[PDB]
Amino acid sequence: QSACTLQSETHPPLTWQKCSSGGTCTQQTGSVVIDANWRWTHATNSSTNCYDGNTWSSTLCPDNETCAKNCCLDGAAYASTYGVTTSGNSLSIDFVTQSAQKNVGARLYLMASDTTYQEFTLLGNEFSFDVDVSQLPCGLNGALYFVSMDADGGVSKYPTNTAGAKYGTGYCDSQCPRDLKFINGQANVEGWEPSSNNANTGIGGHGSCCSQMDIWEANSISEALTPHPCTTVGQEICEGDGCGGTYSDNRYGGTCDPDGCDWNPYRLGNTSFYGPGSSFTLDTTKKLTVVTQFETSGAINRYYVQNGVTFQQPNAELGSYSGNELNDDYCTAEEAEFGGSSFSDKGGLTQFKKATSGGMVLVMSLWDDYYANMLWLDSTYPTNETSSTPGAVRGSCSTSSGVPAQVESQSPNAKVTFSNIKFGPIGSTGNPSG
Numbered sequence: 001q002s003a004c005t006l007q008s009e010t011h012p013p014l015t016w017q018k019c020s021s022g023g024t025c026t027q028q029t030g031s032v033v034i035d036a037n038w039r040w041t042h043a044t045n046s047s048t049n050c051y052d053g054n055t056w057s058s059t060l061c062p063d064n065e066t067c068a069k070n071c072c073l074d075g076a077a078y079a080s081t082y083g084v085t086t087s088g089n090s091l092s093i094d095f096v097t098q099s100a101q102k103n104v105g106a107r108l109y110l111m112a113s114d115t116t117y118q119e120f121t122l123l124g125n126e127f128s129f130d131v132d133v134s135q136l137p138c139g140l141n142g143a144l145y146f147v148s149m150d151a152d153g154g155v156s157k158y159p160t161n162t163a164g165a166k167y168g169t170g171y172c173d174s175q176c177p178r179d180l181k182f183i184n185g186q187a188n189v190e191g192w193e194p195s196s197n198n199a200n201t202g203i204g205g206h207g208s209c210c211s212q213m214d215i216w217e218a219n220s221i222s223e224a225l226t227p228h229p230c231t232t233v234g235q236e237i238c239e240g241d242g243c244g245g246t247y248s249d250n251r252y253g254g255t256c257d258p259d260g261c262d263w264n265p266y267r268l269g270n271t272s273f274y275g276p277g278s279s280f281t282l283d284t285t286k287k288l289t290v291v292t293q294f295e296t297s298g299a300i301n302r303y304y305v306q307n308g309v310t311f312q313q314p315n316a317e318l319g320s321y322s323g324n325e326l327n328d329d330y331c332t333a334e335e336a337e338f339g340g341s342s343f344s345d346k347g348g349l350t351q352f353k354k355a356t357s358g359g360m361v362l363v364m365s366l367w368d369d370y371y372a373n374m375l376w377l378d379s380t381y382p383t384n385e386t387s388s389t390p391g392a393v394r395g396s397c398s399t400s401s402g403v404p405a406q407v408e409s410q411s412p413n414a415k416v417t418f419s420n421i422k423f424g425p426i427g428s429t430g431n432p433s434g
């Protein structure tokens with residue numbers, strides 16, 4: 001797709017800190033850009049929409065190539081249309097924003113410049129951020145994660161994409177999302193199937209895969225940490241059900257691991273660690289700091305800070321495993337106890353180290369789940385299972401919670417605030433900010 005300028009594109013600024021082993025942290029100035037899927041897509045020579053509701057214009061978009069040549073992405077009014085605002089080192093995303101139309105959530109990327117994404121090499125480093133999930137009830141997910149996207153949004157690889165990172169192109173993740181309107185410089189009109197439960201989305205004939213590090217997927221009820229390896233580390237197009245993931249039929253027939261080796265304290269047995277109120281170790285009605293360390297062995301460590309008190313990831317006992325570190329032993333024990341083989345089949349933490357050894361783009365989003373109502377994160381899943389079934393209970397939310405239409409009408413003012421992002425060598429982010 002190309003870019004149009006009927007609406008100016010001004011990326012909201014966002015500062016963050018880069019720390020060093022020497023003990024100092026320096027302020028960096030970046031900005032955020034909203035994903036292309038949320039943008040107005042119209043004809044290059046007019047205001048005629050190329051996509052409307054959950055269907056494409058059959059005249060402007062008869063096929064993927066023609067559609068890409070006839071259509072362009074336009075600018076976004078961050079605050080008024082998407083409910084996205086920034087203030088210093090803080091970023092807030094509103095759940096539902098009512099303007100000329102109804103907008104639900106957003107997916108944003110941290111930029112290095114006005115035309116490029118900031119790339120982070122995670123291996124041997126740690127990532128820290130403060131978050132306020134107090135306004136996120138059951139069914140919502142304020143996520144912060146990393147994906148192996150190209151810095152230019154794919155412009156160098158796909159000439160027909162001239163919008164680039166400036167317009168949030170090039171997304172990919174372990175689910176090999178087929179709901180993307182543009183992939184590899186072409187539209188996704190071929191094989192398009194409008195969603196039967198969402199009037200604004202659909203599924204196309206192609207998806208976009210890549211490694212994904214889910215550092216934070218959470219609400220006020222539950223939180224999970226999940227690395228997702230792929231046989232091909234970087235962004236790669238997939239076709240049909242060969243994509244696997246949520247959007248396809250055979251979930252495990254793809255190149256990526258849609259499940260991952262997840263770590264949810266509640267799912268692992270500690271039901272008093274994270275929750276709303278003073279009866280929980282970490283009170284989700286108050287802000288908290290989340291630190292994630294990527295050691296060179298490929299293992300992942302995590303600790304939290306609230307009101308100046310530090311709490312390491314709680315200890316978990318799963319089969320022959322015992323500890324608080326996400327490593328090979330943990331992931332092997334999880335597949336043995338909870339079932340599955342997707343993570344190991346995709347290479348596990350060893351294959352995932354290839355992703356963290358390279359650059360990954362920071363993503364921050366807020367979304368509700370039209371496929372599984374976020375039950376996999378904060379409830380019993382599958383819903384037919386009981387508490388006696390290992391790993392079935394992931395949170396205290398009712399199995400009837402998370403209906404998109406219901407949460408959107410009942411909790412429109414829900415929102416998430418991410419702030420004070422710090423990145424640097426392991427052991428450096430707790431030092432004085434500059």
Ligand SMILES: *[C@@H]1O[C@H](CO)[C@@H](O)[C@H](O)[C@H]1NC(C)=O
Nearest residue numbers: 270271272273281311314315
């Ligand atoms: C949950 O984790 C916290 C922090 O490590 C700990 O103090 C508490 O004893 C744990 N509770 C259970 C039931 O394991």
Ligand SMILES: [Ca+2]
Nearest residue numbers: 295297299325
């Ligand atoms: Ca270790």
